[PDB]
């Protein structure tokens with residue numbers, strides 16, 4: 001079956017942040033306006049027996065003094081008085097500032113995504129679901145002791161740690177506009193979790209990693225060759241993108257033969273995202289996102305689908321709805337008919353002025369990247385004594 005994470009307390013908490021506003025509500029309601037929920041299995045957010053239990057789960061990756069800091073920051077914003085100079089210092093050393101500011105529910109908000117992506121992992125492991133979806137999750141920039149890119153808690157890292165600890169190999173696929181640095185960094189020294197991010201990279205653009213470095217870093221220790229990256233120039237469209245990641249996705253599958261696939265499905269590659277970097281759409285005659293998702297799903301490997309970036313909320317909703325519906329069809333087999341027009345629901349007016357499901361947009365370096373990545377794959381396989389037909393993989397290009 002196919003699972004979605006949601007719940008009343010959960011929705012309220014994914015909607016209390018100053019930067020993502022009510023995106024989670026727009027998304028889950030568009031999913032629900034399209035009569036998609038009955039076809040889906042509700043996966044509830046995980047809860048803990050006690051504070052100590054919550055704490056041990058989060059510090060499987062995040063440092064204790066960082067969890068302390070984030071929780072002190074929520075308390076401080078639930079008070080009216082401002083932060084002491086000493087408290088400012090504490091928060092800065094955890095980068096709890098700038099694009100990672102505090103707000104009254106910041107710890108509860110960060111914890112929720114962890115709660116959802118942990119329940120999603122658990123529903124895959126006990127084989128209740130073949131695929132689970134969590135649009136509240138996907139915060140791939142959070143580091144052990146540092147907030148970054150409005151990510152305070154790395155739900156992905158933790159959902160992944162739970163999968164490998166259930167030989168178990170996980171493929172992480174990161175379709176966001178930004179390089180999934182945190183997730184990549186977390187499994188830098190591990191071969192059982194292969195990471196692969198495709199993204200924009202250019203000077204001064206966040207975060208800075210996922211590209212040629214002062215050549216190409218790709219993992220250390222036994223983790224060597226296990227972190228993959230494809231940085232693209234700006235302006236790329238659906239088909240060029242599709243052709244850029246397609247062979248890489250197929251080859252990672254054949255070579256690695258993953259026990260689980262975790263997909264950060266960040267929506268900021270859309271043409272209508274305020275970033276205006278990539279020209280990806282949500283069209284389904286073809287959307288680069290849909291191509292990739294449907295490819296990943298044809299593999300029949302249990303799969304986690306996560307959110308991430310996306311700062312045009314109605315258009316992120318337009319994509320993630322299509323992804324949801326696609327997943328339902330490629331897993332259960334039954335056809336999903338989606339009206340081209342946005343159905344009436346409480347957020348309908350946000351989708352104006354034309355109320356269409358399609359977003360409103362009109363549509364060499366890569367081969368030197370394909371060749372470099374094929375070599376890296378071969379080195380990965382050789383290091384990890386994996387059997388595979390070199391030619392069969394080579395043909396995919």
Ligand SMILES: COc1ccc(Cn2ccc3ccc(C(=O)NO)cc32)cc1
Pocket residue numbers: 099141148149150176178206266268274275276308309310311
């Ligand atoms: C162009 O419009 C924008 C809207 C929101 C933001 C927010 N923002 C600032 C720094 C930063 C880093 C990473 C991400 C992200 O989506 N990671 O997945 C978002 C970020 C910037 C521009």
Ligand SMILES: [K+]
Pocket residue numbers: 174175176177178179180197198199
């Ligand atoms: K990415």
Ligand SMILES: [K+]
Pocket residue numbers: 187188189190191193194195219223226227
């Ligand atoms: K790795």
Ligand SMILES: [Zn+2]
Pocket residue numbers: 176177178266268308309310
């Ligand atoms: Zn992003």
